[PDB]
């Protein structure tokens, strides 16, 4: 009755695509689903990656009975190297479940951060395994085709009912590794009755079905076969299926594959070791291939953190240290832009063409296919589960809304669909489902020096300047008061008002001296009036830095 | 032989979509094709619109024999209110040709800028007219279906051959005003021999044919008919065909049409007067409709300058003074985002859904169709003209390149295709076509106070701060030297280095005093060393504002 209710607390991945992490709780036992990162879009220079704030988990660490990872994509496990130490410290006994490849990639990262091997309790399971979590949760994972092998959804059985989480998925009828989705557990759950459905909303706006990775492999074979000279291919480091497809295409035309990008080299190494990747010869470095005929070279590349942008941007503008675009090169962008980078990629494409390269990119060219289900696939899942409650996930509000409308057009629509938000606390009972509160939530920014180096504050006033400009007022508080006003990125109309600013500042400074006021109070007497005056006369709110010095 | 060559100088519209203006010259006679503006993408706050720099025209004004306008879209005539006074002053005898609607909208704008009626010599012509320009140019305009009535291309006959300019176009088989494209002149030119083709590259990446404005009108009728309450529709003020379609849809379901947005009210007024728009009742204001049942109201709106963004952004965030979104409202974005605003619109869409509105937007919903030709239409034009030379225009580099590849796949590809750039000078002879130089070119920024208020400089260092932050060093040069260092939007790692900055600054200040150096030289002694030190220790180049005051 009362004590019977599951709490679902999303800390990332809701209303957005990235840094996925969802907390599940029944009474005093918790388990977490994934812990990803989010890549920063350009315009946020210096930032290497974003991670979810996990205050709630740091506070309730003792109640965490397990951490479950659905697959090895950066936005699902990418944050763990930072989050685990924040929650448990340098070590923990807590079971961290994941498939072979998922944990394989995770260890590569943990190790890379100085985390001792075996410091954390990683339990390798099958993509289709069943695991008991504490006294209240029985998890039945099921394999789903996606853009990385060993990907799962999970049927979450609780004391008050079943929750089906589709995980990230598409229903690829012909996956590159020959491992089709396993829907038995999902259909079965549907027939018994699904209380809540949490499903991938990425392509809820798209009619039809997502093309198979096999279609892309064949199209990649096609365009690479016709390439005159060198071929560059960019994609995420974790897109193992795409990488295999490229490798196959290269090998079909006698090309040797070189690889650039720390993360991708690392992940491919692991995939090769574990058997997920196969290469007839081997993977080379840029140097080892620098002297081969153009027609015999294919380069696979991505950014240092695993995303293509930084390397595409360098090939286009700043210039890359180990490689450079030349007329005749063929560049294939075999991935889609991170949300917020669409038009930054367009500029890269424009610039790449001007360098003389034949650029092939999506959606104009079929050199990429989403790793997520389109409407026909989502409808199949909706009918398979016919959930009482529905919580669209893995997508921005428009994606979530469109999935809601899609669900509402089914034979037996959900009793209710909530639009999930990060930090929201959802209460689920056998008969109800609602948001009952919130917990601290947000994002931490990471760069070469770790977390904290860059902050919301540093970014907030970085925009205040970018959009309004700067006005520096230098005041000398003494018996010989002096005021100097200078500005930057400020409107000319406003600049011509700096003389007036200077004078009203002097009066404030002189008056401040007379009253024997502290400098900070004199700073205020200057700041406020000047701020008011300027907006009242320009409609702009430039950043006003008043510096008052006694002397 | 020698003296025989036409010079084509693009000052805007090349390698981009917007602010179109192309200069044509033979010996000492010039004529200009259009003079548009470009809308600013968000991120460039304060800026109302962009205009082409016309130094070349201001210098050679005496040689200008005519100005020809192809249609009334803001990116073709929108800049004229600024450019004409810059080139000729308050008045000019120069013939400015354009169709009835084109000149109708132009006068509305000129008047709005204080330009006396008749100050400029506007010659109304038919969309299919023939006009003589000076001694060397004979222009044969031809009607082309587009997103505004009275739209033309032009066959430019010169002493060394024919140049076909498609103008902006698509081949709509069923235009809303029943005025189909007129291709006789184009096909005829093709049969006689076309020396150079200048064609609309907007959709050169798109296979097939662009949907008819009639398809959209019918789809708009469809979605508006099912709307429960109020309906908001956003689009450009100059999209007369779309406006008529919306008006028809509203009238079919007994809805009254209100209109918000100065520019759109102005343009619709003119269109109604001239007969291009028809309304069964009349157009109302927000107030006049504020008390009608939701189901009987349809609002047509756009930004003050004619673009939808500012009004969509206000309906979503800041809040609009005269109207507000409420649960149940239906909002239809019946236009595509300006280049660079795609993801800004996505945020608007997300926010609009969260306000409880049913949002319909392209491409997810067929509530908009491009006003430009897709590949099948472009191929038809290519075969119709089979030009010797080709100059893709009205699109960014990727659009231009794709059109080039498209041309190269034809039966008789052009002898050569050049990728046009703004400011480039192209020399055309009966046998050759090449870039032979450049002229000053660029963009001027316009806001409420006119041109110059915002500048490249103001923007350049506005980005330097946005991406690197600020470091203000305040130094008092006297016998009691004092140095204070403060920063904003600067990396914490760097901030912890402000103490060191402070000290190396003091030493520079004290040494400056000893040498009796001028303050500006002391500023340098501080600036440079500090700049070097910090990048050498953080890899960042923050803006360093050194302020040295004697006292
Ligand atoms: Zn994902
Ligand atoms: Zn994924
Ligand atoms: Zn145009
Ligand atoms: Zn146009």
Swiss-Prot record, chains A, B:
Cellular localisation: Cytoplasm
Main location per the UniProt record: cytoplasm
Gene Ontology biological process terms, A to Z: rRNA processing
Keyword Transcription regulation recorded: no
Enzyme Commission (EC) number: 3.1.-.-
Names of the cofactor(s): Zn(2+)
Gene3D superfamilies named among the record's database cross-references: 3.10.20.580, Metallo-hydrolase/oxidoreductase (3.40.50.10710), Ribonuclease Z/Hydroxyacylglutathione hydrolase-like (3.60.15.10)
Site-annotated residues for Substrate binding: 38
A cellular component term, taken from the record's GO annotations: cytoplasm
Keyword entries, A-Z: Cytoplasm, Endonuclease, Exonuclease, Hydrolase, Metal-binding, Nuclease, RNA-binding, rRNA processing, Zinc
Co-factor remark: Binds up to 2 Zn(2+) ions per subunit. It is not clear if Zn(2+) or Mg(2+) is physiologically important.
GO molecular function: 5'-3' RNA exonuclease activity; identical protein binding; RNA binding; RNA endonuclease activity; zinc ion binding
Effect recorded for residue 73 to A: Catalytically inactive
Signal peptide stretch: none
Residues annotated for substrate binding in this entry: 237-239, 368-372
Enzyme class: hydrolase
Annotated Zn(2+) 1 binding sites: 71, 73, 146, 168
InterPro entries: Metallo-B-lactamas (IPR001279), RibonucZ/Hydroxyglut_hydro (IPR036866), RMMBL (IPR011108), RNase_J (IPR004613), RNase_J_2 (IPR042173), RNase_J_b_CASP (IPR055132), RNase_J_bac (IPR030854), RNase_J_C (IPR041636)
Residues reported to bind Zn(2+) 2: 75-76, 168, 394
Subunit structure: Homodimer. May be a subunit of the RNA degradosome.
Annotated PANTHER family: RIBONUCLEASE J (PTHR43694:SF1)
Family recorded in the similarity comment: Belongs to the metallo-beta-lactamase superfamily. RNA-metabolizing metallo-beta-lactamase-like family. Bacterial RNase J subfamily.
Function, in words: An RNase that has endonuclease and possibly 5'-3' exonuclease activity. Probably involved in maturation of rRNA and in some organisms also mRNA maturation and/or decay.
Protein's name in the database: Ribonuclease J
Organism: Thermus thermophilus (strain ATCC BAA-163 / DSM 7039 / HB27)
UniProt gene name: rnj
């Amino acid at each position: 009755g009362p004590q019977d209710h599951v709490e679902i607390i999303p800390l990332g991945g809701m209303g957005e695509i990235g840094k996925n992490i969802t907390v599940f709780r029944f009474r005093d036992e918790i388990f977490v689903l994934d812990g990803g990162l989010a890549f920063p879009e350009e315009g946020m220079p210096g930032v290497d990656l974003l991670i979810p704030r996990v205050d709630y988990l740091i506070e309730h660490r003792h109640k965490i009975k397990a951490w479950v990872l659905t697959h090895g994509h950066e936005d699902h496990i990418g944050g763990l190297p930072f989050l685990l130490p924040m929650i448990f410290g340098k070590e923990s006994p807590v079971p961290i479940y994941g498939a072979r490849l998922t944990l394989g990639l995770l260890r590569g990262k943990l190790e890379e951060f100085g985390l001792r091997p075996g410091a954390f309790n990683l339990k390798e399971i099958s993509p289709d395994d069943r695991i008991q979590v504490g006294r209240y949760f029985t998890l039945d994972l099921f394999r789903m085709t996606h853009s990385i092998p060993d990907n799962s959804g999970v049927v979450i059985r609780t004391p008050i009912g079943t929750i089906v989480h589709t995980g990230d998925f598409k229903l690829d009828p012909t996956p590159i590794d020959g491992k089709v989705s396993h829907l038995a557990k999902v259909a079965q759950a549907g027939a018994e009755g699904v209380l809540l459905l949490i499903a991938d909303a990425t392509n809820a706006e798209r009619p039809g079905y997502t093309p198979s990775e096999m279609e892309i492999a064949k199209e990649l074979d096609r365009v690479i076969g016709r390439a005159p000279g060198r071929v560059f291919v960019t994609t995420f480091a974790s897109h193992i299926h795409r990488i295999q497809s490229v490798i196959w295409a290269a090998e079909k035309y006698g090309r040797k594959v070189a690889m650039e990008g720390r993360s991708m080299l690392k992940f491919s190494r692991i995939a090769l070791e574990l058997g997920y990747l196969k290469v007839k010869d081997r993977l080379y470095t840029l140097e080892e291939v620098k002297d081969l005929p153009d027609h015999q070279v294919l380069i696979l590349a991505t950014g240092s953190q695993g995303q293509p942008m930084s390397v595409l941007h360098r090939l286009a503008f700043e210039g890359h240290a180990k490689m450079a675009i030349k007329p005749g090169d063929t560049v294939i962008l075999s991935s889609s832009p991170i949300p917020g980078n669409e038009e930054a990629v367009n500029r890269v494409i424009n610039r790449l063409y001007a360098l003389g390269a034949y650029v092939l990119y999506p959606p104009t060219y079929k050199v990429h296919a989403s790793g997520h289900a389109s409407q026909e696939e989502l409808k199949l899942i909706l009918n398979l589960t016919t959930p009482r409650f529905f919580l669209p996930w893995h997508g921005e509000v428009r994606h979530q809304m469109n999935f809601k409308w899609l669900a509402e057009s089914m034979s037996r629509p959900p009793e209710k669909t909530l639009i999930g938000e990060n930090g929201a606390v959802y209460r689920l009972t056998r008969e109800t489902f609602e948001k009952v509160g919130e917990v601290p939530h947000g994002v931490l920014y990471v760069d070469g020096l770790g977390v904290g180096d860059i902050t919301e504050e540093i970014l907030a006033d970085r925009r205040h300047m970018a959009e309004e400009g700067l006005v520096v007022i230098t005041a000398l508080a003494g018996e010989d008061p002096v005021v100097e006003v200078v500005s930057r990125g400020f409107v000319k109309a406003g600049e011509r008002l700096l003389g007036e600013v200077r004078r009203m500042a002097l009066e404030a400074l002189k008056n401040g001296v007379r009253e024997k006021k502290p400098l900070e109070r004199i700073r205020d007497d200057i700041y406020y009036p000047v701020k008011k005056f300027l907006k009242k006369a320009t409609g702009r709110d430039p950043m006003i830095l008043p510096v008052v010095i006694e002397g």
